[PDB]
Amino acid sequence: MDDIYKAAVEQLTEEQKNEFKAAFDIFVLGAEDGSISTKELGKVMRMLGQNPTPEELQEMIDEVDEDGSGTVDFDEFLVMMVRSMKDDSKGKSEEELSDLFRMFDKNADGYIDLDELKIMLQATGETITEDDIEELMKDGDKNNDGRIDYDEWLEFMKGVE
Missing domain, CATH: 1.10.238.10 (EF-hand)
Known part of the structure; x- marks a missing residue:
C-alpha cells in the first residue's frame, strides 16, 4: 500500500517535523517562504573553507523544485527521507x-x-x-x-x- 511516503509514515512519527524545525527556522531566518538550501553536510563541510566540491551542490539544490512550485515545504523535506534521494537533484537554473x-x-x-x-x-x-x-x-x-x-x-x- 501507499505510494512511497504514505508507507513510511506508518512507521514514522510526524512529531519529527518539529524536531528538525529548529535548524530549519534558523536557516530560513531570511527566507519568507521557507526558501533555503537542503545541503546540510555540504554547508558545514564547505564552511571550513576546503577544496572546491560542494559549490556545485548548491546549484542542483538551487532548483531542486521538481514540481515547479517555487519553494520547498518542511513536509516536502520529510518525505524526502523515506525515499532517500541519496545525491543529485538538478542542474543549473x-x-x-x-x-x-x-x-x-x-x-x-x-x-x-x-x-x-x-x-x-x-x-x-x-x-x-x-x-x-x-x-x-x-x-x-x-x-x-x-x-x-x-x-x-x-x-x-x-x-x-
Whole structure:
C-alpha cells in the first residue's frame, strides 16, 4: 500500500517535523517562504573553507523544485527521507543560464567552446578524461549547427548526471 511516503509514515512519527524545525527556522531566518538550501553536510563541510566540491551542490539544490512550485515545504523535506534521494537533484537554473551562458563564453564569440565548458570540470577534481568532454559538447547542439548558442545552453542539461 501507499505510494512511497504514505508507507513510511506508518512507521514514522510526524512529531519529527518539529524536531528538525529548529535548524530549519534558523536557516530560513531570511527566507519568507521557507526558501533555503537542503545541503546540510555540504554547508558545514564547505564552511571550513576546503577544496572546491560542494559549490556545485548548491546549484542542483538551487532548483531542486521538481514540481515547479517555487519553494520547498518542511513536509516536502520529510518525505524526502523515506525515499532517500541519496545525491543529485538538478542542474543549473532557468535565470542562471542567462549568466552561466556568457560566463562560459570566454571566447566572446557568442558560442561555447570545449576548453571553455570542460574548463569547469578542470577545477573541481572530476573523475573523467579531458578528451571525454569533447563528446559532451557534441550533444550541446540543438539548433543544428555544431556549436552552442543562446538557446542550446538551456536545453543542455536535459537530464545529464
